[PDB]
Curated annotation (Swiss-Prot), chain B:
The keyword Lipoprotein does not apply. Transmembrane segments: none annotated. This is Octopine catabolism/uptake operon regulatory protein OccR. Keywords: Activator, DNA-binding, Plasmid, Transcription, Transcription regulation. The keyword Transmembrane does not apply. Belongs to the LysR transcriptional regulatory family. The chain holds residues 92 to 298 of 298 of the full protein. Coiled coil: none annotated. It comes from the Bacteria. One of its GO terms (molecular function) is sequence-specific DNA binding. Positive regulatory protein for the occ operon involved in octopine catabolism and uptake. Also acts as a negative regulator of its expression.
């Protein structure tokens, strides 16, 4: 009960999770925590094999053998400060014509659906990245714009403007636990308080 | 129709490279760039197979068949803003006594050597991570301390403090190119201009002398 082993996709594992963990451990100085950043596929493996107590991954995943909590967050467009797209309430694919859109080969279903959504839109030669965080870094430095999940965006909210994407595309987050896992109060408390933290943070910023 | 393909380890791929890339591409409007984050082992394969023009990996690495430029910088101690250790000139292992030191299990020789250097110090039950960026996030959020390479932590210096580590553990960065690969002026430009960008920034913060 003084053990908390977490496996998560690098998205949450590098943003919202360390942020919430910092608050969660204030009560518990003797708590031994492991926060491992893994691909979504290996996150499922870590939970199933018992190497991790909680798993966080990108949907979709096969549910057999797992207890799963889910969230769906609409796609948003991230633009530099003062960019003309900040003048809109809702950004369409056509509004991206002639922009330098950062392409994200992250391997998620979300990223793929996003790229086809803007498949016929004229654009300048891209910068193709492999991480959502890297894309946002380039937008912050003014190298272009990106289409993302809002959870990845929230730690860039000061130097970057967000707008809802006109195409209805949701990013699905999974909280994963083993259906035959060991009863744990600390895991119950963490998973419960994290979603509350997540939901409150997203709703406060008009992202949910 | 020039395309630049760069594979890099988390240390440079997450911070310094994107920041430099934004500057490098602004007056090259029709230049197409790919920046793929990969493990150091996969970076070597990316360069060896031609799937990447330039490679950036942790050291040491199998040199045979490559053209490699080397950087080596001392390990620094990353503490939260206003932490007690921020008032010290150098941080000794004994100075880290009773501190929450985020354990980094990244597979690098640097991180492994680091964990050996502080294995004789009694730490609080810390937080284990597999990503150096996760450790830096935790330091920023005030969750603990971390010994890390300066080039990966330089992007976090807005909210964290870097102090010299009294044990001289050097992180080795490699610029990797195919010895067989055809000559390229855009690559010659990027590689040398990046190192000047890297060196200047490290010197500006006393992380390089």
């Amino acid at each position: 009960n003084a053990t908390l082993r977490i496996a998560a996709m690098p998205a949450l594992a590098n943003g919202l999770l360390p942020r919430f963990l910092a608050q969660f451990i204030r009560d518990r100085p003797n708590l031994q925590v492991s926060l491992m950043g893994l691909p979504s596929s290996m996150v499922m493996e870590a939970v199933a094999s018992g190497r991790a107590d909680i798993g966080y991954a990108d949907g979709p995943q096969e549910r057999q053998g797992f207890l799963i909590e889910t969230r769906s967050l609409p796609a948003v467009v991230a633009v530099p400060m003062g960019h003309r797209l900040a003048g809109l309430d809702r950004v369409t694919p056509q509004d991206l014509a002639g922009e330098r859109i950062i392409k994200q080969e992250t391997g998620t279903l979300f990223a793929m659906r996003v790229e086809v959504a803007i498949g016929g839109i004229q654009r300048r030669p891209s910068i193709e990245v492999s991480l959502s965080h890297t894309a946002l870094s380039l937008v912050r430095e003014g190298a272009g714009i990106a289409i993302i999940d809002p959870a990845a965006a929230i730690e860039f909210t000061d130097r970057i403007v967000l707008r809802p994407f006109s195409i209805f595309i949701d990013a699905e987050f999974l909280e994963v636990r083993s259906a035959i896992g060991a009863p744990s109060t600390i895991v119950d408390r963490f998973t419960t308080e994290f979603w509350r933290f997540h939901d409150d943070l997203m709703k406060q910023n008009g992202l949910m």
